[PDB]
Amino acid sequence: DCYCRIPACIAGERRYGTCIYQGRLWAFCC
Amino acid sequence: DCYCRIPACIAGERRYGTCIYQGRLWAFCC
């Protein structure tokens, strides 16, 4: 599964894009 | 929980944002 995360992706995930949610930028991680 | 969905949010979810991946925009649904 992929998640939108702040401040960064966690162990075992790589960032693939960006999410826009609650007026902020999130890393899209999978 | 929230998920990026295509083409839009599933029944009983609402669109609160966008997930951007390789030029594509997906619905961020909670």
Short mmCIF file of all heavy atoms in Angstrom, two decimals, unseen atoms left out:
data_model
loop_
_atom_site.label_atom_id
_atom_site.label_comp_id
_atom_site.label_asym_id
_atom_site.label_seq_id
_atom_site.Cartn_x
_atom_site.Cartn_y
_atom_site.Cartn_z
N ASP A 1 0.93 -1.15 0.00
CA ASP A 1 0.00 0.00 0.00
C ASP A 1 0.97 1.20 0.00
O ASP A 1 2.16 1.06 0.39
CB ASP A 1 -1.02 -0.09 1.12
CG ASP A 1 -2.32 -0.85 1.06
OD1 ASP A 1 -2.53 -1.73 0.19
OD2 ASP A 1 -3.25 -0.61 1.88
N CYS A 2 0.42 2.30 -0.47
CA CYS A 2 1.14 3.57 -0.57
C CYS A 2 0.46 4.53 0.45
O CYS A 2 -0.76 4.49 0.68
CB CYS A 2 1.12 4.19 -1.97
SG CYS A 2 1.98 3.34 -3.30
N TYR A 3 1.29 5.39 0.98
CA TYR A 3 0.82 6.36 1.96
C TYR A 3 1.32 7.75 1.68
O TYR A 3 2.38 7.77 1.07
CB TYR A 3 1.52 6.04 3.32
CG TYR A 3 1.14 4.66 3.77
CD1 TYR A 3 1.95 3.63 3.31
CD2 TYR A 3 0.02 4.38 4.52
CE1 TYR A 3 1.67 2.31 3.61
CE2 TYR A 3 -0.30 3.05 4.84
CZ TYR A 3 0.54 2.05 4.40
OH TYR A 3 0.27 0.72 4.66
N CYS A 4 0.59 8.71 2.22
CA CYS A 4 1.03 10.14 2.14
C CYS A 4 1.66 10.37 3.55
O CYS A 4 0.96 10.06 4.54
CB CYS A 4 -0.20 10.99 1.91
SG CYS A 4 -0.74 10.84 0.18
N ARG A 5 2.91 10.78 3.62
CA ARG A 5 3.63 10.94 4.88
C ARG A 5 4.38 12.23 5.01
O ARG A 5 4.90 12.81 4.06
CB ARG A 5 4.71 9.87 5.01
CG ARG A 5 4.17 8.47 5.07
CD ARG A 5 5.28 7.60 5.62
NE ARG A 5 4.95 6.21 5.52
CZ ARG A 5 4.13 5.60 6.37
NH1 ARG A 5 3.53 6.25 7.39
NH2 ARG A 5 3.79 4.30 6.21
N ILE A 6 4.48 12.65 6.27
CA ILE A 6 5.23 13.87 6.70
C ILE A 6 5.98 13.36 7.96
O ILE A 6 5.35 12.65 8.75
CB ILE A 6 4.34 15.09 6.98
CG1 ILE A 6 3.95 15.88 5.71
CG2 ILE A 6 5.01 16.10 8.01
CD1 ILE A 6 2.65 16.77 6.04
N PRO A 7 7.24 13.64 8.13
CA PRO A 7 8.04 14.47 7.23
C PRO A 7 8.67 13.74 6.06
O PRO A 7 9.25 14.35 5.13
CB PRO A 7 9.09 15.00 8.22
CG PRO A 7 9.30 13.93 9.24
CD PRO A 7 7.97 13.19 9.33
N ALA A 8 8.66 12.41 6.08
CA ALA A 8 9.29 11.56 5.05
C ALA A 8 8.77 10.15 5.11
O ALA A 8 7.97 9.74 5.95
CB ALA A 8 10.78 11.53 5.34
N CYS A 9 9.23 9.39 4.09
CA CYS A 9 8.88 7.96 3.93
C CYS A 9 9.65 7.20 5.02
O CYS A 9 10.71 7.68 5.48
CB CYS A 9 9.26 7.41 2.52
SG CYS A 9 8.40 8.29 1.21
N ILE A 10 9.12 6.08 5.45
CA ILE A 10 9.78 5.31 6.53
C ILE A 10 10.55 4.14 5.98
O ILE A 10 10.56 3.95 4.75
CB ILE A 10 8.75 5.01 7.64
CG1 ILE A 10 7.71 3.91 7.31
CG2 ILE A 10 7.94 6.29 8.05
CD1 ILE A 10 6.75 3.75 8.58
N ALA A 11 11.21 3.36 6.81
CA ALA A 11 12.00 2.22 6.39
C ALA A 11 11.19 1.27 5.54
O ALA A 11 10.10 0.86 5.91
CB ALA A 11 12.51 1.50 7.63
N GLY A 12 11.80 0.91 4.42
CA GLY A 12 11.12 -0.06 3.53
C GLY A 12 10.17 0.52 2.51
O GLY A 12 9.44 -0.28 1.85
N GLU A 13 10.16 1.84 2.37
CA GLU A 13 9.34 2.60 1.42
C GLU A 13 10.22 3.48 0.57
O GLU A 13 11.34 3.79 1.02
CB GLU A 13 8.38 3.60 2.07
CG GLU A 13 7.36 2.88 2.93
CD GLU A 13 6.41 3.78 3.62
OE1 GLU A 13 6.72 4.97 3.72
OE2 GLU A 13 5.37 3.34 4.03
N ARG A 14 9.79 3.91 -0.58
CA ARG A 14 10.61 4.86 -1.40
C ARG A 14 9.61 5.95 -1.74
O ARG A 14 8.40 5.62 -1.78
CB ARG A 14 11.27 4.12 -2.60
N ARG A 15 9.98 7.16 -1.92
CA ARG A 15 9.03 8.22 -2.25
C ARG A 15 8.75 8.21 -3.76
O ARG A 15 9.74 8.24 -4.55
CB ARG A 15 9.72 9.56 -1.97
CG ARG A 15 8.81 10.69 -2.45
CD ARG A 15 9.34 12.01 -2.04
NE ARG A 15 8.32 13.02 -2.25
CZ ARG A 15 8.25 14.27 -1.80
NH1 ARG A 15 9.22 14.69 -0.99
NH2 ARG A 15 7.28 15.12 -2.16
N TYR A 16 7.50 8.21 -4.15
CA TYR A 16 7.19 8.17 -5.60
C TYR A 16 6.49 9.41 -6.06
O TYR A 16 6.29 9.52 -7.27
CB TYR A 16 6.24 6.99 -5.96
CG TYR A 16 7.03 5.71 -5.90
CD1 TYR A 16 6.94 4.91 -4.78
CD2 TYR A 16 7.86 5.35 -6.96
CE1 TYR A 16 7.66 3.70 -4.71
CE2 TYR A 16 8.62 4.17 -6.91
CZ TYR A 16 8.52 3.36 -5.78
OH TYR A 16 9.23 2.18 -5.63
N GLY A 17 6.12 10.30 -5.19
CA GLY A 17 5.40 11.49 -5.68
C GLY A 17 5.10 12.36 -4.46
O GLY A 17 5.79 12.20 -3.44
N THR A 18 4.12 13.19 -4.60
CA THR A 18 3.64 14.13 -3.61
C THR A 18 2.13 14.10 -3.38
O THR A 18 1.37 13.83 -4.37
CB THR A 18 4.00 15.57 -4.13
OG1 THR A 18 5.45 15.46 -4.28
CG2 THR A 18 3.57 16.69 -3.19
N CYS A 19 1.68 14.35 -2.16
CA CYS A 19 0.23 14.41 -1.94
C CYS A 19 -0.07 15.82 -1.49
O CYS A 19 0.81 16.44 -0.91
CB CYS A 19 -0.31 13.49 -0.92
SG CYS A 19 0.48 11.84 -0.99
N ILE A 20 -1.26 16.26 -1.75
CA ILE A 20 -1.70 17.56 -1.31
C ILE A 20 -2.83 17.20 -0.39
O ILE A 20 -3.74 16.53 -0.87
CB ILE A 20 -2.13 18.41 -2.50
CG1 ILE A 20 -0.87 18.78 -3.33
CG2 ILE A 20 -2.94 19.64 -2.05
CD1 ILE A 20 -1.21 19.50 -4.64
N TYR A 21 -2.80 17.61 0.86
CA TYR A 21 -3.87 17.28 1.81
C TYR A 21 -3.70 18.21 3.02
O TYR A 21 -2.58 18.38 3.45
CB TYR A 21 -3.76 15.83 2.21
CG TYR A 21 -4.59 15.30 3.33
CD1 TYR A 21 -6.01 15.32 3.30
CD2 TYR A 21 -3.95 14.76 4.44
CE1 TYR A 21 -6.76 14.79 4.34
CE2 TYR A 21 -4.71 14.23 5.50
CZ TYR A 21 -6.11 14.27 5.44
OH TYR A 21 -6.81 13.71 6.47
N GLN A 22 -4.83 18.75 3.41
CA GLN A 22 -4.93 19.69 4.55
C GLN A 22 -4.00 20.90 4.46
O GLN A 22 -3.40 21.26 5.48
CB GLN A 22 -4.67 18.98 5.87
CG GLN A 22 -5.66 17.84 6.02
CD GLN A 22 -6.71 17.99 7.06
OE1 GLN A 22 -7.08 16.98 7.67
NE2 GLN A 22 -7.11 19.20 7.40
N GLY A 23 -3.91 21.44 3.29
CA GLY A 23 -3.12 22.58 2.85
C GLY A 23 -1.63 22.28 2.91
O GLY A 23 -0.94 23.31 3.00
N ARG A 24 -1.12 21.09 2.94
CA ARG A 24 0.29 20.82 3.04
C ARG A 24 0.71 19.79 1.99
O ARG A 24 -0.22 19.11 1.57
CB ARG A 24 0.66 20.11 4.38
CG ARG A 24 -0.27 20.50 5.50
CD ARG A 24 0.33 21.01 6.76
NE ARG A 24 1.80 21.06 6.56
CZ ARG A 24 2.53 20.94 7.71
NH1 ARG A 24 1.84 21.01 8.85
NH2 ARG A 24 3.81 20.56 7.57
N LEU A 25 2.00 19.72 1.80
CA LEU A 25 2.64 18.77 0.88
C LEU A 25 3.07 17.54 1.66
O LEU A 25 3.62 17.72 2.80
CB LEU A 25 3.86 19.50 0.26
CG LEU A 25 3.55 20.68 -0.65
CD1 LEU A 25 4.83 21.16 -1.28
CD2 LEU A 25 2.58 20.23 -1.76
N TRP A 26 2.86 16.35 1.17
CA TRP A 26 3.22 15.08 1.82
C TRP A 26 4.05 14.27 0.81
O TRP A 26 3.87 14.51 -0.40
CB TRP A 26 1.94 14.27 2.11
CG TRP A 26 0.95 14.93 2.99
CD1 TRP A 26 0.26 16.08 2.64
CD2 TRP A 26 0.51 14.60 4.33
NE1 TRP A 26 -0.53 16.47 3.70
CE2 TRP A 26 -0.41 15.59 4.74
CE3 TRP A 26 0.86 13.59 5.24
CZ2 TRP A 26 -1.04 15.61 5.99
CZ3 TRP A 26 0.22 13.63 6.49
CH2 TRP A 26 -0.70 14.59 6.85
N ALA A 27 4.91 13.41 1.24
CA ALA A 27 5.67 12.57 0.33
C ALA A 27 4.72 11.41 -0.03
O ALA A 27 4.04 10.91 0.88
CB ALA A 27 6.90 12.03 1.05
N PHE A 28 4.61 10.95 -1.25
CA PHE A 28 3.77 9.77 -1.56
C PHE A 28 4.81 8.66 -1.51
O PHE A 28 5.78 8.66 -2.32
CB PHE A 28 3.12 10.02 -2.92
CG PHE A 28 2.37 8.85 -3.47
CD1 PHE A 28 1.27 8.39 -2.76
CD2 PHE A 28 2.78 8.22 -4.65
CE1 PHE A 28 0.53 7.29 -3.21
CE2 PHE A 28 2.05 7.11 -5.12
CZ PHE A 28 0.95 6.68 -4.39
N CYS A 29 4.59 7.70 -0.62
CA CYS A 29 5.57 6.61 -0.40
C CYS A 29 5.00 5.25 -0.60
O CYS A 29 3.90 5.06 -0.12
CB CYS A 29 5.87 6.69 1.11
SG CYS A 29 6.51 8.30 1.64
N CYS A 30 5.79 4.39 -1.21
CA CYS A 30 5.30 3.03 -1.43
C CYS A 30 6.40 2.03 -1.16
O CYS A 30 7.59 2.34 -1.21
CB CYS A 30 4.90 2.83 -2.91
SG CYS A 30 3.78 4.05 -3.63
N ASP B 1 -9.08 5.02 6.96
CA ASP B 1 -7.75 5.63 6.71
C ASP B 1 -7.88 6.26 5.30
O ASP B 1 -8.97 6.00 4.69
CB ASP B 1 -6.59 4.67 6.91
CG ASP B 1 -6.51 4.13 8.37
N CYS B 2 -6.85 6.98 4.88
CA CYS B 2 -6.90 7.65 3.56
C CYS B 2 -6.10 6.92 2.49
O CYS B 2 -5.01 6.47 2.83
CB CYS B 2 -6.38 9.10 3.64
SG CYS B 2 -7.29 10.08 4.87
N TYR B 3 -6.68 6.89 1.30
CA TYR B 3 -6.10 6.25 0.13
C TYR B 3 -6.23 7.06 -1.15
O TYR B 3 -7.19 7.75 -1.30
CB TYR B 3 -6.77 4.87 -0.11
CG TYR B 3 -6.19 3.99 0.97
CD1 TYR B 3 -6.93 3.50 2.04
CD2 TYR B 3 -4.81 3.71 0.93
CE1 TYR B 3 -6.33 2.71 3.04
CE2 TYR B 3 -4.18 2.94 1.90
CZ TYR B 3 -4.96 2.43 2.96
OH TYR B 3 -4.37 1.64 3.93
N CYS B 4 -5.25 6.93 -2.02
CA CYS B 4 -5.25 7.58 -3.35
C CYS B 4 -6.11 6.65 -4.23
O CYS B 4 -5.86 5.44 -4.19
CB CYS B 4 -3.86 7.54 -3.88
SG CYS B 4 -2.73 8.60 -2.98
N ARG B 5 -7.07 7.21 -4.90
CA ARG B 5 -8.00 6.42 -5.71
C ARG B 5 -8.23 6.98 -7.10
O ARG B 5 -8.27 8.18 -7.33
CB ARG B 5 -9.42 6.42 -5.13
CG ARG B 5 -9.52 5.98 -3.69
CD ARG B 5 -9.51 4.54 -3.44
NE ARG B 5 -10.04 4.23 -2.09
CZ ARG B 5 -9.65 3.10 -1.49
NH1 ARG B 5 -8.88 2.21 -2.11
NH2 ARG B 5 -9.90 2.78 -0.20
N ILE B 6 -8.45 6.02 -7.97
CA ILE B 6 -8.74 6.30 -9.40
C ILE B 6 -9.96 5.46 -9.78
O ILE B 6 -10.16 4.30 -9.36
CB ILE B 6 -7.33 6.13 -10.02
CG1 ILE B 6 -7.30 6.53 -11.53
CG2 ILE B 6 -6.82 4.68 -9.79
CD1 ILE B 6 -7.30 5.18 -12.35
N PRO B 7 -10.88 6.08 -10.53
CA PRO B 7 -10.87 7.44 -11.02
C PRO B 7 -11.36 8.45 -9.97
O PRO B 7 -11.23 9.68 -10.12
CB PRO B 7 -11.95 7.43 -12.13
CG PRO B 7 -12.93 6.42 -11.67
CD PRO B 7 -12.13 5.37 -10.90
N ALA B 8 -12.02 7.93 -8.94
CA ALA B 8 -12.55 8.80 -7.87
C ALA B 8 -12.75 7.94 -6.62
O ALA B 8 -12.50 6.72 -6.63
CB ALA B 8 -13.79 9.51 -8.30
N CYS B 9 -13.19 8.66 -5.61
CA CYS B 9 -13.46 8.03 -4.31
C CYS B 9 -14.62 7.02 -4.40
O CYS B 9 -15.64 7.25 -5.05
CB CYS B 9 -13.74 9.08 -3.23
SG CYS B 9 -12.34 10.25 -2.93
N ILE B 10 -14.39 5.97 -3.66
CA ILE B 10 -15.26 4.77 -3.44
C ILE B 10 -16.43 5.21 -2.59
O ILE B 10 -16.45 6.29 -1.95
CB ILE B 10 -14.24 3.67 -2.98
CG1 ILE B 10 -13.61 3.04 -4.30
CG2 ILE B 10 -14.57 2.54 -1.95
CD1 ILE B 10 -12.72 1.81 -3.86
N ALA B 11 -17.51 4.43 -2.54
CA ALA B 11 -18.73 4.77 -1.75
C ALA B 11 -18.40 4.92 -0.25
O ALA B 11 -17.72 4.03 0.27
CB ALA B 11 -19.82 3.73 -1.87
N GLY B 12 -18.90 6.03 0.27
CA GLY B 12 -18.66 6.29 1.71
C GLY B 12 -17.31 6.91 2.06
O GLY B 12 -16.87 6.90 3.27
N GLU B 13 -16.64 7.46 1.06
CA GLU B 13 -15.35 8.14 1.24
C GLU B 13 -15.58 9.52 0.63
O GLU B 13 -16.55 9.66 -0.12
CB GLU B 13 -14.16 7.54 0.58
CG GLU B 13 -13.86 6.10 0.96
CD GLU B 13 -12.72 5.53 0.18
OE1 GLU B 13 -12.51 6.05 -0.92
OE2 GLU B 13 -12.09 4.62 0.65
N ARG B 14 -14.74 10.46 1.02
CA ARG B 14 -14.81 11.83 0.54
C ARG B 14 -13.37 12.18 0.10
O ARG B 14 -12.41 11.65 0.66
CB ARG B 14 -15.25 12.89 1.54
CG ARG B 14 -16.64 13.17 2.02
CD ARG B 14 -17.36 14.37 1.42
N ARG B 15 -13.31 13.07 -0.85
CA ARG B 15 -12.10 13.55 -1.45
C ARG B 15 -11.56 14.73 -0.62
O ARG B 15 -12.28 15.72 -0.59
CB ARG B 15 -12.18 14.02 -2.91
CG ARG B 15 -10.77 14.22 -3.48
CD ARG B 15 -10.89 14.87 -4.82
NE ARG B 15 -9.61 15.04 -5.47
CZ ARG B 15 -9.22 15.02 -6.75
NH1 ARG B 15 -10.16 14.76 -7.71
NH2 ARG B 15 -7.95 15.20 -7.16
N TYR B 16 -10.40 14.53 -0.05
CA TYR B 16 -9.79 15.59 0.77
C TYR B 16 -8.48 16.08 0.15
O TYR B 16 -7.84 17.04 0.68
CB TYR B 16 -9.52 15.01 2.17
CG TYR B 16 -10.78 14.80 2.94
CD1 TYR B 16 -11.30 13.51 3.16
CD2 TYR B 16 -11.46 15.88 3.47
CE1 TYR B 16 -12.44 13.32 3.90
CE2 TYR B 16 -12.65 15.68 4.19
CZ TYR B 16 -13.14 14.42 4.41
OH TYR B 16 -14.29 14.27 5.13
N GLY B 17 -8.02 15.49 -0.94
CA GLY B 17 -6.76 15.89 -1.53
C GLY B 17 -6.46 15.19 -2.85
O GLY B 17 -7.36 14.64 -3.49
N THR B 18 -5.21 15.25 -3.22
CA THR B 18 -4.70 14.70 -4.46
C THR B 18 -3.36 14.04 -4.27
O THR B 18 -2.54 14.58 -3.50
CB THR B 18 -4.43 15.87 -5.51
OG1 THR B 18 -5.62 16.68 -5.54
CG2 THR B 18 -4.10 15.44 -6.94
N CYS B 19 -3.18 12.95 -4.99
CA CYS B 19 -1.89 12.25 -4.99
C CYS B 19 -1.35 12.44 -6.42
O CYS B 19 -2.08 12.22 -7.40
CB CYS B 19 -1.99 10.85 -4.67
SG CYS B 19 -3.18 10.48 -3.39
N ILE B 20 -0.15 12.91 -6.49
CA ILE B 20 0.50 13.20 -7.76
C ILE B 20 1.56 12.15 -7.98
O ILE B 20 2.47 12.08 -7.17
CB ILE B 20 1.08 14.66 -7.74
CG1 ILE B 20 -0.11 15.62 -7.38
CG2 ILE B 20 1.65 15.08 -9.10
CD1 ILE B 20 0.53 17.00 -7.14
N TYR B 21 1.48 11.41 -9.07
CA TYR B 21 2.48 10.39 -9.39
C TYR B 21 2.69 10.41 -10.93
O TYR B 21 1.70 10.30 -11.72
CB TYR B 21 1.95 9.00 -8.87
CG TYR B 21 2.77 7.85 -9.42
CD1 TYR B 21 4.04 7.60 -8.97
CD2 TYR B 21 2.32 7.07 -10.51
CE1 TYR B 21 4.82 6.58 -9.50
CE2 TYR B 21 3.10 6.07 -11.05
CZ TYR B 21 4.35 5.81 -10.58
OH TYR B 21 5.20 4.82 -11.00
N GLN B 22 3.94 10.59 -11.31
CA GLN B 22 4.28 10.58 -12.73
C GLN B 22 3.29 11.27 -13.64
O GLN B 22 2.73 10.67 -14.57
CB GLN B 22 4.33 9.07 -13.16
CG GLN B 22 5.45 8.29 -12.55
CD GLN B 22 6.81 8.67 -13.09
OE1 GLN B 22 7.77 8.95 -12.34
NE2 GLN B 22 6.89 8.79 -14.41
N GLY B 23 3.02 12.51 -13.38
CA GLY B 23 2.11 13.35 -14.15
C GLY B 23 0.64 13.09 -13.98
O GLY B 23 -0.22 13.83 -14.49
N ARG B 24 0.31 12.05 -13.25
CA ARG B 24 -1.12 11.71 -13.03
C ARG B 24 -1.57 12.26 -11.67
O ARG B 24 -0.78 12.22 -10.74
CB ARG B 24 -1.18 10.18 -13.05
CG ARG B 24 -0.86 9.47 -14.36
CD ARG B 24 -0.45 8.04 -14.10
NE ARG B 24 0.64 7.48 -14.91
CZ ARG B 24 0.61 7.09 -16.19
NH1 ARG B 24 -0.46 7.08 -17.02
NH2 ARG B 24 1.71 6.63 -16.80
N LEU B 25 -2.84 12.64 -11.62
CA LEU B 25 -3.44 13.13 -10.39
C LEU B 25 -4.49 12.14 -9.93
O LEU B 25 -5.44 11.94 -10.72
CB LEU B 25 -4.09 14.50 -10.58
CG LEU B 25 -3.22 15.64 -11.02
CD1 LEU B 25 -4.18 16.83 -11.14
CD2 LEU B 25 -2.26 16.08 -9.94
N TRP B 26 -4.37 11.54 -8.77
CA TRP B 26 -5.32 10.65 -8.15
C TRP B 26 -6.02 11.37 -6.99
O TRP B 26 -5.51 12.32 -6.36
CB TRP B 26 -4.52 9.47 -7.62
CG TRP B 26 -3.83 8.76 -8.75
CD1 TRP B 26 -4.25 8.70 -10.06
CD2 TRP B 26 -2.63 7.99 -8.67
NE1 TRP B 26 -3.36 7.93 -10.80
CE2 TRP B 26 -2.36 7.49 -9.96
CE3 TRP B 26 -1.79 7.68 -7.60
CZ2 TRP B 26 -1.28 6.68 -10.26
CZ3 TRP B 26 -0.68 6.89 -7.87
CH2 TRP B 26 -0.45 6.39 -9.18
N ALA B 27 -7.21 10.95 -6.70
CA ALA B 27 -8.06 11.44 -5.60
C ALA B 27 -7.48 10.86 -4.30
O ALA B 27 -7.17 9.66 -4.27
CB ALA B 27 -9.47 10.94 -5.72
N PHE B 28 -7.38 11.76 -3.31
CA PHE B 28 -6.90 11.34 -1.97
C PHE B 28 -8.23 11.24 -1.22
O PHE B 28 -8.82 12.30 -1.06
CB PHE B 28 -5.94 12.28 -1.30
CG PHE B 28 -5.34 11.71 -0.04
CD1 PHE B 28 -4.67 10.47 -0.10
CD2 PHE B 28 -5.44 12.42 1.15
CE1 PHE B 28 -4.10 9.88 1.04
CE2 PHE B 28 -4.84 11.83 2.31
CZ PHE B 28 -4.17 10.60 2.25
N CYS B 29 -8.70 10.11 -0.86
CA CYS B 29 -9.97 9.84 -0.24
C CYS B 29 -9.92 9.27 1.18
O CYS B 29 -9.19 8.27 1.34
CB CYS B 29 -10.58 8.66 -1.08
SG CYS B 29 -10.72 9.16 -2.83
N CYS B 30 -10.78 9.85 1.99
CA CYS B 30 -10.81 9.35 3.39
C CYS B 30 -12.20 8.88 3.73
O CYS B 30 -13.16 9.43 3.20
CB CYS B 30 -10.29 10.43 4.37
SG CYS B 30 -8.70 11.15 3.92
#
